Ligand binder design. Structure first.
Ligand code: MET
Ligand code: MET
Ligand SMILES: [Zn+2]
Ligand SMILES: [Zn+2]
Lengths: 160, 161
């Protein structure tokens, strides 16, 4: 039933941006959900601590590069399969705009030099404060920068 | 900066529902993001495989119980901290309605008897088809049902400096 079950994962490129779905609010406003695929499904996977550290940094940097007059990010969360993130937002930016904000966000991640520099890693502001790894996050960022970010279109991912 | 960082996790009850934020689209439609907290922060945590299996089931069951004329779920995803899920949707249901749909979804999870019974767990429909544990998901569901779903309100979670 779920939309992610209707797309062929063996045909996905990664790192890559895919518009998962678009929705219209009652009054006619647009909501878009993006599949930010970091890893090749079933060939690569992010570590639990790395994806957690990346989530903190990424949810902040993506908002820095993407929020504006026509865009308001609703939520950015890691996928259970740990091969990427889902980003939902008010607005209708295309894959290119999203991929360029993602790329700049990876450079930003690399700019975060030490874990001790991340303020919110304590029992008051984080749910599992010791479940972190800036090193894994740095490694993921460098890998995305080195591989480049492509695009996946639902039309080319049909399942029979 | 992030909203999640402005609330005191040491004061949160779990399992519990919290309205993390409400937003207005340009035309004035409502969007609500819910923090479905399964675990007491920094005391309990969900397993990586268990939260993955739970994600599949929960995302489907919550939509069955909540989607209707004035509610449309945008996304339901696990938190990096593995202590819960964030659910974003078009609409304005309150904590009680969400908690009841959640509780019902837990019973639904218990109704999924064998992992081999879950269709989408393959290389075509899932990104990490082997990273699953129906056992952990059942354990999580029973735990939630046994403990009951409370409510956390942003007002009671104020954080000093
Ligand atoms: C602060 S970690 C990310 C929390 C939430 N998923 C957000 O997009 O803000
Ligand atoms: C792979 S389970 C589906 C998860 C996705 N975030 C959804 O809300 O449908
Ligand atoms: Zn955290
Ligand atoms: Zn999956």
């Amino acid at each position: 039933l779920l939309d992610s079950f209707k797309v062929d994962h063996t045909k996905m490129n990664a790192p890559a941006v895919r518009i998962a779905k678009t929705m219209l609010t009652p009054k006619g406003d647009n909501i878009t959900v993006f599949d930010l695929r970091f890893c090749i499904p079933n060939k690569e996977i992010l570590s639990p601590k790395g994806i957690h550290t990346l989530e903190h940094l990424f949810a902040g940097f993506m908002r820095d590069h993407l929020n504006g007059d026509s865009i308001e990010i609703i939520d950015i969360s890691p996928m259970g399969c740990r091969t990427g993130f889902y980003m939902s937002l008010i607005g209708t930016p295309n894959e290119q705009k999203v991929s360029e904000a993602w790329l700049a966000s990876m450079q930003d991640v690399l700019g975060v030099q030490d874990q001790a520099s991340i303020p919110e890693l304590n029992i008051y502001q984080c749910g599992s404060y010791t479940e972190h790894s800036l090193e894994d996050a740095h490694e993921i960022a460098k890998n995305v920068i080195a591989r480049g970010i492509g695009v996946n279109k639902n039309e080319d991912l049909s399942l029979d």
